[PDB]
Amino acid sequence: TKVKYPDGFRSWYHVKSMVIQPGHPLENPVGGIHHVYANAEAIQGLRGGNYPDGAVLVFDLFDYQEDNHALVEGKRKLIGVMERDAKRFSATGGWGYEGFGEGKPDKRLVTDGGQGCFGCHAAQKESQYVFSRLRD
Amino acid sequence: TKVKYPDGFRSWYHVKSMVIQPGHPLENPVGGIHHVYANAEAIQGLRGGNYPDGAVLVFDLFDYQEDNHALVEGKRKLIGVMERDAKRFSATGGWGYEGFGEGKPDKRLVTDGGQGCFGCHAAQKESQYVFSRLRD
Ligand code: HEC
Ligand code: HEC
Ligand SMILES: [Zn+2]
Numbered sequence: 001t002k003v004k005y006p007d008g009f010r011s012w013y014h015v016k017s018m019v020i021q022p023g024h025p026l027e028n029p030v031g032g033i034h035h036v037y038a039n040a041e042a043i044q045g046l047r048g049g050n051y052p053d054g055a056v057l058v059f060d061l062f063d064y065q066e067d068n069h070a071l072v073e074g075k076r077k078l079i080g081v082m083e084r085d086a087k088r089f090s091a092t093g094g095w096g097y098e099g100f101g102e103g104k105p106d107k108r109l110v111t112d113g114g115q116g117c118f119g120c121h122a123a124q125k126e127s128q129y130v131f132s133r134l135r136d
Numbered sequence: 137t138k139v140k141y142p143d144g145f146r147s148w149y150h151v152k153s154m155v156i157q158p159g160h161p162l163e164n165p166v167g168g169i170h171h172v173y174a175n176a177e178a179i180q181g182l183r184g185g186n187y188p189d190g191a192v193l194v195f196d197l198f199d200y201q202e203d204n205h206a207l208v209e210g211k212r213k214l215i216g217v218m219e220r221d222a223k224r225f226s227a228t229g230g231w232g233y234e235g236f237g238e239g240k241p242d243k244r245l246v247t248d249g250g251q252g253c254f255g256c257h258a259a260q261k262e263s264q265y266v267f268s269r270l271r272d
């Protein structure tokens with residue numbers, strides 16, 4: 001019933017990025033530069049196939065510094081993780097939701113079985129609870 | 137003596153990202169959100185080895201739209217490409233420097249055999265002419 005830490009996610013496929021700056025509704029708690037990563041199984045789902053069990057998506061969040069009209073990546077704040085298991089994570093739509101503080105395997109963040117996460121991702125039922133779109 | 141178009145670069149290892157905002161000394165031409173990618177061979181150099189022939193680094197530049205203090209990726213503006221070949225690219229320190237407008241293989245940007253590119257990258261001779269640092 002727990003989400004596996006996604007070991008080696010930094011070597012996976014880079015889906016997309018975004019910057020969330022102060023004044024953005026979501027600046028607490030996902031302010032910063034984020035990168036979405038997808039393992040091979042998650043790419044099947046992102047391309048418009050179905051997500052196999054074992055699909056993992058990672059939201060990789062960095063603090064940033066202002067450096068002379070540049071935003072420069074600072075420390076990692078956290079990662080968010082969605083792991084596909086239709087049976088084991090059926091209470092949250094077939095995805096397990098977990099957060100790791102500073103991307104550390106020992107700093108698990110989710111306390112409610114991922115019901116809060118799922119609460120928002122549920123809006124994306126039609127794209128199997130994934131916001132991120134594959135781009136060129 | 138032309139740099140090959142790095143087909144498949146979007147499936148490569150994501151090294152790092154940076155936002156260059158208007159007013160940066162290099163807004164013309166690299167204003168936008170950029171993502172650096174490395175093929176397997178380029179990873180060897182980023183980790184502290186010698187860059188082998190066939191190492192390729194890509195600078196993937198996107199426009200962005202500031203939308204309610206999110207910076208949202210728009211269209212690709214260009215890619216920059218460094219291709220390692222100690223013999224063939226000897227005049228520019230063993231890297232071949234090319235740009236592709238909108239990331240299209242038909243839209244070569246470099247017109248001076250890469251001397252201007254080399255002129256700036258020479259400052260990084262001690263890190264084999266590479267600015268980007270591999271981060272976890
Ligand atoms: C709305 C109020 C959200 C809540 C609460 C959570 N997430 Fe979410 N997440 C949200 C958005 C708008 C996005 C897209 C970001 C973008 O750049 O487009 C995401 C994305 C993720 C991802 C990447 C996969 C995807 O769906 O795009 C992961 C892995 C992810 N989120 C995990 C996650 C977890 C673990 C949450 C609870 C701790 C959680 N999210 C909350 C919107 C919202
Ligand atoms: C200084 C005035 C530069 C000139 C002219 C060119 N480049 Fe360069 N480039 C520069 C910096 C500071 C960086 C690092 C960006 C970062 O996020 O840290 C880069 C990066 C690249 C890369 C990625 C590999 C690396 O060295 O980090 C490539 C592939 C690259 N640049 C290509 C490139 C080409 C093709 C150029 C002439 C058209 C060129 N650059 C010019 C600084 C400067
Ligand atoms: Zn200024």
Ligand SMILES: [Zn+2]
Pocket residue numbers: 021202204205
């Ligand atoms: Zn703003």
